[PDB]
Amino acid sequence: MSLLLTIAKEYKRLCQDAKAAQMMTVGTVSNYTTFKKWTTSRKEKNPSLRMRWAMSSKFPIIANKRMLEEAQIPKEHNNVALWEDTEDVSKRDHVLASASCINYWNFCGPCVNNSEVIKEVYKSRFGRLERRKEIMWKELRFTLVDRQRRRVDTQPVEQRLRTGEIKDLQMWTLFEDEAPLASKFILDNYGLVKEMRSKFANKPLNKEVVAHMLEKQFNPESRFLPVFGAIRPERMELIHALGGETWIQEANTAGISNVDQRKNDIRAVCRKVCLAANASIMNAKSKLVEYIKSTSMRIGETERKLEELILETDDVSPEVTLCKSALGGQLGKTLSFGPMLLKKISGSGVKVKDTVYIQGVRAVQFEYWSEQEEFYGEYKSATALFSRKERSLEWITIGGGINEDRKRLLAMCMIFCRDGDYFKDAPATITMADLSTKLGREIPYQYVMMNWIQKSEDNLEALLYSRGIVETNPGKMGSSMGIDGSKRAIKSLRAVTIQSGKIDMPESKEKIHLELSDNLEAFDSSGRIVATILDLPSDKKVTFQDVSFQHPDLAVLRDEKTAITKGYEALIKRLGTGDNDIPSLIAKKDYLSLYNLPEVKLMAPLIRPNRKGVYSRVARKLVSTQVTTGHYSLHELIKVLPFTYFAPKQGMFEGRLFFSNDSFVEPGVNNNVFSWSKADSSKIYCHGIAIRVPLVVGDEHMDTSLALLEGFSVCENDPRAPMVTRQDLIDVGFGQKVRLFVGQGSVRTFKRTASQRAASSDVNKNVKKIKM
Amino acid sequence: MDMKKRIHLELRNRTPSDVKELVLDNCRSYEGKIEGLTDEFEELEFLSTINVGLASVANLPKLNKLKKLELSDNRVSGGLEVLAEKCPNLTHLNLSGNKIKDLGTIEPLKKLENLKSLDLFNCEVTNLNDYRENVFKLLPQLTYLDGYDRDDKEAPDS
Amino acid sequence: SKTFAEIAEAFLEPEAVRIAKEAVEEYGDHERKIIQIGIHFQVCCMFCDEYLSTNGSDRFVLIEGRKRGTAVSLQNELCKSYDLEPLPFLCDIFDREEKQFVEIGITRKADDSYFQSKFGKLGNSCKIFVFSYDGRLDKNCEGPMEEQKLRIFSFLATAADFLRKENMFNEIFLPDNEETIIEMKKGKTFLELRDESVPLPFQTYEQMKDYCEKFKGNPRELASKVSQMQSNIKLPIKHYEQNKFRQIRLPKGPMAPYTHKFLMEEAWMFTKISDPERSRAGEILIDFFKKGNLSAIRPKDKPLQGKYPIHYKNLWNQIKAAIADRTMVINENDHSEFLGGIGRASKKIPEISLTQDVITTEGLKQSENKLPEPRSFPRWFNAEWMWAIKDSDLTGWVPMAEYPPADNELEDYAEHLNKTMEGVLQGTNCAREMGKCILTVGALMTECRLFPGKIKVVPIYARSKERKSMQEGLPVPSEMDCLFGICVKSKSHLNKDDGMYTIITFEFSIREPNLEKHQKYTVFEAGHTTVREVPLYLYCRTTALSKIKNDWLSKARRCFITTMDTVETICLRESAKAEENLVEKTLNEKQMWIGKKNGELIAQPLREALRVQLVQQFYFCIYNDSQLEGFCNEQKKILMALEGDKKNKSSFGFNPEGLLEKIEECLINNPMCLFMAQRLNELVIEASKRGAKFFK
Amino acid sequence: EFSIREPNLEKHQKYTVFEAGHTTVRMKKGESVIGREVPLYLYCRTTALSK
Amino acid sequence: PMAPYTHKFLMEEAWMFTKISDPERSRAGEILIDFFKKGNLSAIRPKDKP
RNA sequence: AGUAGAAACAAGGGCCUUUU
């Protein structure tokens, strides 16, 4: 308004100068950032002394002037000085104010209607508070603690994201007029944005603070700390008040934040799909990728794509690793040999060949690495630090707390190093059948011996006996391990050391881009294997909740419900741009041409034939009623259209529309067959399966011009077309052009025509036509 | 969205003096307060405001030709005195889905001598004893209540 | 991040990434070009779009991703089959419905230069399409299909936004054909220098580069030089057991006198009851003035010791007068001017205005710094240390905040222990000195901030609370304001940190002085005071301070933290070894050696030894200097050697004599260093009865 | 337990309450049945018992 | 303060879903599962803040 | 006078730079 005119006058005055003009004319807008640093640069060494000296004065702060005049803030109440007309050297528009002035405002001053929005701004810390309040403390005890050092997360966070996925989110919720082009993360996560937008809209707020708080709300604070007991963010956030080196304040904190359940579900799904793709013989790679992209799952309220969560988590499991490898997702340098965990500290080497005779004379190749290399190893409640040297386990130290876990870790380590005579001459018990190739897929002798151990405890005992045994020398009695896993004995194993106190887990902030084979075995720029499908449980049955396996092979429904779902899908795919589609017809109010679509003609056979006319009447009625005015709900037409194909008739409609399979849908209420919500207006739930509706038009429920972006696209710039805003963008015609401003210092030309095709397929298929 | 944009959109270049109907359902109004309404709307005879986070009806301007109103899905409570002065020619009213506790809040509606039908559903008042009868004895001019007259006579379509 | 490939993987398909990677490896070019190529390749892909011809067959055939030889083979095969002319150069894609190759280009500059160069190079042989990241197109034929264009421009827009966000939208990553050679603009002078900073045997950076890029390892010469250097060195190794540590040689001379600004043991104070209304320093100094004792004082012109007694006497009279005037202010006279160093700041003399005659007139030699002089061991330090361990007849000397609520056993334990320790410590004498310093320094800092360039009057006081007797008698003991003396500042124009503002100290005592200890003071005989009547003395001196010492003295509540840490650590360690609450027992039972008497060792529970550590920390806070810093930094070696001796660890060293020298170098005219050094000698002596590695 | 009636602070003190979406109510309309959607509440409470 | 509700269940403020009774499934474990099948319970998703 | 250190202060610019 008048303020706008003042801004224009100021811009004019500033351009009248020469230097300001040169700088606002030369270069791009990014220079602003640079200019933001050359100004207001001043620091202090010990702000503490300076603060005390400074606050001692009688008007130590600065403050706005007009805000005080408007706030009718006087210069005294009962004789205490509150501010004095004057000018700071830096701001030039601020006045020196007293500490007493702040107190004055809070006690009696300018009241505001409401302030509960704060609870949303700092939601993380109110969550901390609530989690604390729901704890039941317990006694306090004194003792020594085995605190192991390791990298963990201290901030419980749902839907952990990246940074590039945030810099955009902070705009569509706060600064939409200055928003950039729509990124994929937005189009995919629409309901999330809508939620974050519903709260911080039409409110008096400082927005920079909100953005900072949102960054914290989406940042898992990763720290390298000493830890004891279970590992959960709910605890690490207050570990300081649970136990130290000499004391422990017992307390139960198991039933809060429901975090690890999501991770175990994810890993179960990963295992399932990995096995599924393994069922194949030549395309398990593409099969797995398809299973991935053909799947989704629910998190709290929202539905997220699997491949998106997989690239955000950090669960180092032999399942997640494979998936993240297929999708080209980089990851850390962490190994996996069966259930155990491993990490290399130093050393090097290279592959080498050797052979062993299974029964009598049966040569079988097995490989082993060359020079000395250190490794840390982590099994359940047990740690170890060992060294391998030319097909032998040189030394090892342990700091666990259990005998069974100790023995299992030791055995798996011995295997990992091919130490012993068994790798020189396998036992009679094993045979060529147990060797490999369940159905053709070979197996290295390593995992063979692995399962041979997991089969019987006596195999493990014999394997341990393969390691040298001697008499426990004096003094080393404490640092010795028997066959049962006892901290001391009269005779103990060879080259072993024990101790109380776990080993400090190493650390490295490194990333690597690995690959995998057609047999589901990943490689890392070397012949080393980081993961496989033999190091995971064999199989198990589970009933996954709030998941969407939208793939034929990964489906249990029959042809009837599947046909209904596919008919709905096809009917939705006509929700794009261009004439002959439902949006253009709605705009033209041609409610009749919808009845003659081909998709309804393909879904008609599924309708109950003895009452198809009556239902048809009702459906057409609703459609006209919604179309003639303009007050329609897109989630009801897509539901009732399949019935408008036949001819109306007479009869009593009793509230429900039945198909030929004794499954109905009701016009207005959500059911198992067709459900949706105003929260997530971009999804349709049919028989549990989810369907993503494109964003071409926005009906009464949808919000803020974020529901038209999938209908627009970029085109060659045309200076003839007009320039408009982001709100009038809805009044354009399908197929028209218009110029527009995007983000900052950028103008482009858009056209309301979509392009459903992506680049994956086009790149993937075209690359397959070149390897011939 | 927002009642302002909704209104400006419904007004497809039409003056706010020749319309006979308006609808603003599935919108939002800051502080549950009307925004964009004036006395300019004179020929308006119908209104529909549903699920807009409304809480009070103080701001609504003077509308005489109005003869039907809908305020369901909101959380209005207490302000029914404003309806008499602003809209004295009203006949049909609906409040199902709002915060209504006692009858003292309903008493002002007696002055709407032009009132014929009222709709109270899902409110606390309905959970009382002798509520239909006591209401009828309070508002005698009224004939229909939630779609049913005395003796439970179902009302016609329209 | 961490590599261009991972970056490209952000908005590209990893397949095209690997493709462009293999390509750059083929041509062996800089791997920074992975991006452009991948983009071009992906464009080609999305340009095919799996379109088809009338015959239900593919319409377009990619030739860009294939090897060069294979690509040319296919090009010639197609030029022959369809009977087309062979092109001189290679292309990217070929179509069948038109039977003419097609070339794709890309650029960032909004100009035709790239399209003009390409059209000159190829004329009109085939179809060329160059797109722009900012929505432009230049070609030599009819436009492409509507879906290739709407799809190609969108991808390029996204990519350009990403790059601009990554600051890589420049010629470096997106060069044209020509600007493909980026290199540091090596000038002339830089090269002239580089060929001059080379080591001796080489004379040009080229020789050094050729010697380093081809350097091979010869372990034998390395080992030979190692042994040679190992023979001409003869590094001494000295096991402490054989070569013991002599005692430390303290300096010799007079004794180190009192240095702290305020008196602690010899201090006398007048007390009154505190009213909450009158609580500022300028008010209490008057309240104590009305009763007449502060005015009853009247020193004489004959001092027991000191200098300039007339100035001190006149200053005291002026102080009394100003107090009577209800204005804590003083006028600038000759006396104050002399005591405050008002005009004794040097006068400047520029050299431009200088001459030899001026120098010869008055010698202007370089200032001969007169470093401090040595001292001897003080015999009055143990007295103060023993006096600062006893109660003071009151408590609450040091203000402290409140205790918050508690919900779990942990906070209960913490509060209990903290209450015990605070109640034990608040009753000592060191505590009242800490509170005195706190409050006096706060007042002085406030004054220096508000009333510079003006001589003021500030009291030396403190606040406390009489101890709590049983419920019998008068309950709810009262508070008390105590006054030990008067203080005065002098124009603290603290233009800069580390500055100095002279002050003056008028204190009250009832104990005659000693020349060795109270050397700087100038005492006067004032009169008598009650308790019966006893004589009175007036200790007076001069000193200065700064911002830093003020801020730190005001922050003198860290000793509590250190002591609590030590004690809680000991108790928790003793409690964990047995897995039981052993805290009260450890405080009441565990004995801590605290001194010698009659040649025997003395011990008292920790509950009473806390006071020693507290006084130690307070003195560290008071006498802190560079000397004490160096000392406390160089004494750790001795303690580690001692510990090694206790555990039969055969320690050793290279040159302990130098360590002793370094230590004894920083022992000068600072009582704390001398005291602690003598005590360390006594420690090693007493331990020699139980340990080796020390000489007598 | 399920309910369609918001609580009062006094009578409902031992109860923890939530809001679980909406539901439907069904009533006669001439010769047919209809359904009118309403909110839905969830009443949570703990208590003991014996044989 | 006023005396609060004490009984275990709710009498007047209650609510109930309905369904037809099958004599072949006249047990709690079966009735509950059947009520759950139609998915009206799964729709019950209480928000975080009470 | 004094401070402290291995050099600096003991105002500097043209009138300016009070509550445990």
Swiss-Prot record, chain A:
GO terms for molecular function: RNA binding; RNA-directed RNA polymerase activity. Keywords: Cap snatching, Eukaryotic host gene expression shutoff by virus, Eukaryotic host transcription shutoff by virus, Host gene expression shutoff by virus, Host nucleus, Host-virus interaction, Inhibition of host RNA polymerase II by virus, mRNA capping, mRNA processing, Viral transcription, Virion. Its main location: virion. GO terms for cellular component: host cell nucleus; virion component. One of its GO terms (biological process) is symbiont-mediated suppression of host mRNA transcription via inhibition of RNA polymerase II activity. It comes from the Viruses. It is found in: Virion; Host nucleus. Pfam families: Flu_PB2_1st, Flu_PB2_2nd, Flu_PB2_3rd, Flu_PB2_4th, Flu_PB2_5th, Flu_PB2_6th, Flu_PB2_7th. Influenza RNA polymerase is composed of three subunits: PB1, PB2 and PA. Interacts (via N-terminus) with PB1 (via C-terminus). Interacts with nucleoprotein NP (via N-terminus). Interacts with host ANP32A (via C-terminus); this interaction promotes viral RNA synthesis. HAMAP family: INV_PB2. Belongs to the influenza viruses PB2 family. This is Polymerase basic protein 2. It comes from Influenza C virus (strain C/Johannesburg/1/1966). The lineage of its organism: Viruses, Riboviria, Orthornavirae, Negarnaviricota, Polyploviricotina. The gene is PB2.
Swiss-Prot record, chain C:
Disulfide bonds: none annotated. Plays an essential role in viral RNA transcription and replication by forming the heterotrimeric polymerase complex together with PB1 and PB2 subunits. The complex transcribes viral mRNAs by using a unique mechanism called cap-snatching. It consists in the hijacking and cleavage of host capped pre-mRNAs. These short capped RNAs are then used as primers for viral mRNAs. The PB2 subunit is responsible for the binding of the 5' cap of cellular pre-mRNAs which are subsequently cleaved after 10-13 nucleotides by the PA subunit that carries the endonuclease activity. The keyword Zinc does not apply. This is Polymerase acidic protein. GO terms for biological process: cap snatching; DNA-templated transcription; symbiont-mediated suppression of host gene expression; symbiont-mediated suppression of host mRNA transcription via inhibition of RNA polymerase II activity; viral RNA genome replication; viral translational frameshifting. Phosphorylated on serines and threonines by host kinases, including human casein kinase II. It is an enzyme of class 3 (hydrolase). Belongs to the influenza viruses PA family. Its EC number is 3.1.-.-. Mn(2+) 2 binds at residues 64, 92. Its main location: host cell. HAMAP family: INFV_PA. It holds the Pfam family Flu_PA. GO terms for molecular function: endonuclease activity; metal ion binding; RNA binding. It is found in: Host cytoplasm; Host nucleus. InterPro entries: INFV_PA, PA/PA-X, PA/PA-X_sf. One of its GO terms (cellular component) is host cell cytoplasm.
Curated annotation (Swiss-Prot), chain D:
Phosphorylated on serines and threonines by host kinases, including human casein kinase II. It is found in: Host cytoplasm; Host nucleus. It comes from the Viruses. Influenza RNA polymerase is composed of three subunits: PB1, PB2 and PA. Interacts (via C-terminus) with PB1 (via N-terminus). Belongs to the influenza viruses PA family. Plays an essential role in viral RNA transcription and replication by forming the heterotrimeric polymerase complex together with PB1 and PB2 subunits. The complex transcribes viral mRNAs by using a unique mechanism called cap-snatching. It consists in the hijacking and cleavage of host capped pre-mRNAs. These short capped RNAs are then used as primers for viral mRNAs. The PB2 subunit is responsible for the binding of the 5' cap of cellular pre-mRNAs which are subsequently cleaved after 10-13 nucleotides by the PA subunit that carries the endonuclease activity. This is Polymerase acidic protein. It comes from Influenza C virus (strain C/Johannesburg/1/1966). The gene is PA. The chain holds residues 508 to 558 of 709 of the full protein.
UniProtKB/Swiss-Prot annotation, chain E:
Coiled coil: none annotated. It is found in: Host cytoplasm; Host nucleus. It comes from the Viruses. Signal peptide: none annotated. Phosphorylated on serines and threonines by host kinases, including human casein kinase II. Belongs to the influenza viruses PA family. Plays an essential role in viral RNA transcription and replication by forming the heterotrimeric polymerase complex together with PB1 and PB2 subunits. The complex transcribes viral mRNAs by using a unique mechanism called cap-snatching. It consists in the hijacking and cleavage of host capped pre-mRNAs. These short capped RNAs are then used as primers for viral mRNAs. The PB2 subunit is responsible for the binding of the 5' cap of cellular pre-mRNAs which are subsequently cleaved after 10-13 nucleotides by the PA subunit that carries the endonuclease activity. Influenza RNA polymerase is composed of three subunits: PB1, PB2 and PA. Interacts (via C-terminus) with PB1 (via N-terminus). This is Polymerase acidic protein. It comes from Influenza C virus (strain C/Johannesburg/1/1966). The lineage of its organism: Viruses, Riboviria, Orthornavirae, Negarnaviricota, Polyploviricotina. The chain holds residues 255 to 304 of 709 of the full protein.
